[PDB]
């Protein structure tokens, strides 16, 4: 897998599990980022789009990492550091995986794409 | 700022048609497609070879596709805003 | 500078007529399509 | 894959110089800059107005700046991989 990434603001899509168990977002800045009502848009090849929505109030602190686990991973939901996507078993697998971070007003602010 | 402008600059353009770009109405879109600009990325291409220059791009849209001042202004603004966010 | 006096719009209809694979005719593509029209006509 | 290729396709290009584009050596880069293609985005723009076409882009690159088969192959492949990810 070849990796491609774009970060417009404070939060980057740092790591994408090729086995689909998680997505990790990192606040690469020295400031706290409000991420309330933000969304993760996951596009695996030609599969239907996967949308994960963040709670209506959520803060990713300066330099911190938040992992969003798919239900299949058997992770424990511990809100600040770890979020469990209960209704979805996988982030998805395939040869092309595109994970985008969308802000509260519908703008793509970050992305990581895994190819081959 | 318009709905078409907001929706265009919010995300990567990918495979979007010329009409998705702000200022590109039905007439202006039909003429750009007639010139071979089926997709909005083909218009971005012209904007990029014209080195993001406003005067050169708006005079180009006017000369080749009959764009009025409001149309050329809106198309350039959307592409400039998009290139700053995604390029 | 072999197909001069021909507008970009007439060069396009000529690319279409000769089934020459092409994109739009703009300042940075003009010379290349004129060369393709020349290569076509001269065969 | 070279280091130049890997660095180019991993992130947005912005206003990076032409030489950052894989396949673009000293001579090639110099020849492009004198033709107005001083930034990699101007060359991406050319690739887009040519509808991302391999034959058309490689032929333009050979005719404009004297690029060889390996150079045009690498410049095309880098722009194609980049546009598939970020456009």
Residue numbers in the entry:
A (entry chain B): 430 to 545
B (entry chain E), D (entry chain D): 3 to 89
C (entry chain G): 2 to 44
What does the paper say about this structure?
One of the best-studied LEM-domain proteins is emerin, a ubiquitously-expressed integral protein anchored at the nuclear membrane. It consists of 254 amino acids including an N-terminal LEM-domain, a large intrinsically disordered region (IDR) and a short transmembrane segment. The emerin LEM-domain binds to the highly conserved DNA-binding protein barrier-to-autointegration factor (BAF, also known as Banf1). Finally, BAF is able to mediate interaction between emerin and the lamin A/C tail.
Interestingly, missense mutations (P22L, T43I) and a small deletion (ΔK37) associated with exclusive cardiac defects were detected in emerin LEM-domain that interacts with the DNA binding protein BAF. Indeed, this emerin LEM-domain directly interacts with the barrier-to-autointegration factor (BAF), an 89-residue protein that binds to double-stranded DNA. Analysis of the 3D structure of the LEM-BAF complex reveals that emerin Pro22 and Lys37 belonged to a well-conserved surface that is involved in BAF binding (in blue on Figure 3a). By contrast, Thr43 mutation was located on the opposite side of the LEM-domain, far from the interface with BAF. Only a few signals corresponding to the residues close to the site of mutation are shifted, demonstrating that the mutations P22L and T43I do not modify the 3D structure of the emerin construct EmN. Finally, we tried to crystallize the ternary complexes formed by the EmN mutants, BAF and the Igfold domain of lamin A/C using the same protocol used for wild-type EmN. We succeeded in solving the 3D structure of the complex containing EmN T43I at a resolution of 2.3 Å. The structure of the mutated LEM-domain bound to the BAF dimer is displayed on Figure 3c. Analysis of the crystal structure of EmN T43I bound to BAF corroborated that this mutation does not perturb the interface with BAF.
